[PDB]
């Protein structure tokens, strides 16, 4: 948008005291990410900068009441959120407000926290023999530990050796600990460092096709940490075994317990293991002096199954800290809303958990873990009233918060609310602007709005 | 014959109904009971219940 207009007199080089409308010029097909700009000058190198000055500002989402003229030109405007007078003229859809009290909007504070406070976590899944065992398994044969009804809390795995992969295929790591499956199997084994990439759905690799075959649609996780500190024996580490020779590839999640001889030629061997007859089993070589690609890595995968059975394994719960004397979002396992949590003296029964009233609304809940009766009450709210003596008289206004003690939003407390913007005088005049409870406001004298 | 159940000819039969301002002529095999008078009963006529 743009608009060109001259000046009327020699200004002090400030923004003029006038109103002007801006018309659109161009609507180029753009939309690239733009967050920073810069203005170019015109240096007259006879280097001279000349004389320039701009008033770059920032735009904000606001509502405006635009006045159109008989010819379609914008003449006036209201900010609708700057001062209570502008809000009154905005909600009245006019520009010359009369003398009296007007309700503009409703005062209401916003919550601060988002506490949950879910119940405790009792049933812990068995993860002490699959992440802390001495020797998990070999590569030619792997183990499988069926897990039962529990809540799979993967946050406890932070105590392992750092710098370990946690690439979860299918599922999302952010939403990982909210998932009710039916069964989860753990397959742990130890391989080299250059074979961690081979453990993936459908990827080329000798160990990925002759030892362990992961399916292409595998939706689980894979964990592999460095084991060079404890699984590296300098005196001939050969306790691990991995297959290298086989007739064909393995099926997804297949157990190759066959130990038959391998034949790369055409002559019968019949169990000799000599020339042209090799043994399809080779042992690793783990030495603390080898490179990272040769260090041992305990790889454990978690296959997740999904059936229409009673969900045995699920995810843990947050159970955040509880805050009192502040309107926050309460999520006590059965409700979602706003309210102030305060200690209540209402004695409940051992089987009761919620609480109603005459209005049929929740007003007291029992904490899940630490049994204690609370008192849910909505935050402070009311009606914002603006006392205006009229635009033709002045522009000073007074705000009246109906039913608010104006302690958590001159200030004077009345029985009808709280008036902020008018002083209370001890005199007694005729009522000009009715407020309530015998309080009246007037624009008298140093002119200002007074209450009496 | 060796193809899976994903593509097999299903003998789909669509039975479309139609009800206008005309006396019905085909209902279920419900045995018509006896008609009594001067007593509140639950009439179950063709389109009246």
């Amino acid at each position, epitope marked *: 948008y743009s608009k060109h207009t001259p000046i009327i007199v020699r200004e002090p080089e400030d923004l003029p005291q006038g109103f002007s409308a801006l018309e659109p010029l161009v609507d180029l097909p753009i939309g690239i990410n733009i967050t920073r700009f810069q203005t170019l000058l015109a240096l007259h190198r006879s280097w001279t900068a000349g004389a320039a000055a701009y008033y770059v500002g920032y735009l904000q989402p606001r509502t405006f009441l635009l006045k159109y003229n008989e010819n379609g030109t914008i003449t006036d405007a209201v900010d609708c959120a700057l001062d209570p007078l502008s809000e009154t003229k905005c909600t009245l859809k006019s520009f010359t407000v009369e003398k009296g009290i007007y309700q503009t909007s409703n005062f209401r504070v916003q919550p601060t926290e988002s506490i949950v406070r879910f119940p405790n976590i009792t049933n812990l899944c068995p993860f002490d023999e699959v992440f802390n065992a001495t020797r998990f398994a070999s590569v030619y044969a792997w183990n499988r530990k069926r897990i039962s009804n529990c809540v799979a809390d993967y946050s406890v795995l932070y105590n392992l050796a750092p710098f370990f992969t946690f690439k979860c295929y299918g599922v999302s790591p952010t939403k990982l600990n909210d998932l009710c499956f039916t069964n989860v199997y753990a397959d742990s084994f130890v391989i080299r460092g250059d074979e961690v990439r081979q453990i993936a759905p459908g990827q080329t690799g000798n160990i990925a096709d002759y030892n362990y075959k992961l*399916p292409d649609d595998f939706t689980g996780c894979v964990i592999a940490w460095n084991s060079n500190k404890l699984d590296s024996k300098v005196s001939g580490n050969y306790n691990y075994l991995y297959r290298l020779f086989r007739k064909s590839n393995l*099926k997804p*999640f297949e157990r190759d317990i066959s130990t038959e001889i391998y034949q790369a030629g055409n002559k019968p061997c019949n169990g000799v293991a000599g020339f042209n007859c090799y043994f399809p089993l080779r042992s690793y070589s783990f030495r603390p002096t080898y490179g990272v690609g040769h260090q041992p890595y305990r790889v454990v995968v978690l296959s997740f199954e*999904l059936l*229409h*059975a009673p969900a045995t394994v699920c995810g843990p719960k947050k159970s955040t800290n509880l805050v009192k004397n502040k309107c926050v979002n309460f999520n006590f396992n059965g409700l979602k809303g706003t309210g102030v949590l305060t200690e209540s003296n209402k004695k409940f029964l051992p089987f009761q958990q919620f609480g109603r009233d005459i209005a049929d609304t929740t007003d007291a809940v029992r904490d899940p873990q630490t049994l204690e009766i609370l008192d849910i009450t909505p935050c402070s709210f009311g009606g914002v009233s603006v006392i205006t003596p009229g635009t033709n008289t002045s522009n000073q206004v007074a705000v009246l918060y109906q039913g608010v003690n104006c302690t958590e939003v001159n200030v004077f407390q009345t029985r009808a609310g709280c008036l902020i913007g008018a002083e209370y005088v001890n005199n007694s005049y005729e009522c000009d602007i009715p407020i309530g409870a015998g309080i009246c406001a007037s624009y008298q004298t140093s002119q200002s709005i007074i209450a009496y | 014959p060796t193809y*899976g159940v*994903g593509h097999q000819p299903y003998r789909v039969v669509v039975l479309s109904f139609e009800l206008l301002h005309a006396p019905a002529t085909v209902c279920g095999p419900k045995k018509s009971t006896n008609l009594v008078k001067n007593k509140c009963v639950n009439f179950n006529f063709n389109g009246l219940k």
Partner: nanobody
Amino acid sequence: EVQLVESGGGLVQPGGSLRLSCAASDFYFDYYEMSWVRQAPGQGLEWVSTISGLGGATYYADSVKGRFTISRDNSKNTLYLQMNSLRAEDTALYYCATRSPFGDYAFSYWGQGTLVTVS
């Protein structure tokens, strides 16, 4: 693709026994899930049982679970179903089908299915 069929359905007296031993031709079942689904006259395909391929446990069904059991020798292809103390409402259309884990519950290719009635 797969040419699995059903065989074993027949007239069974109330409280008898039956062997619904199905088979298949060629498919990857070592990591799939095989299940059973019954079809009562006028109802849908209710779940009966499910044998896991990665595990080997038998996930049972509602109150009629205390009479059914499944097994598998896993040699070439089979899916047994032992019938113990069949009651009146046990007659339905069983379909020896299967599915695939790590995905939606939409079952895989079904079979021709058989019929077992009690009287």
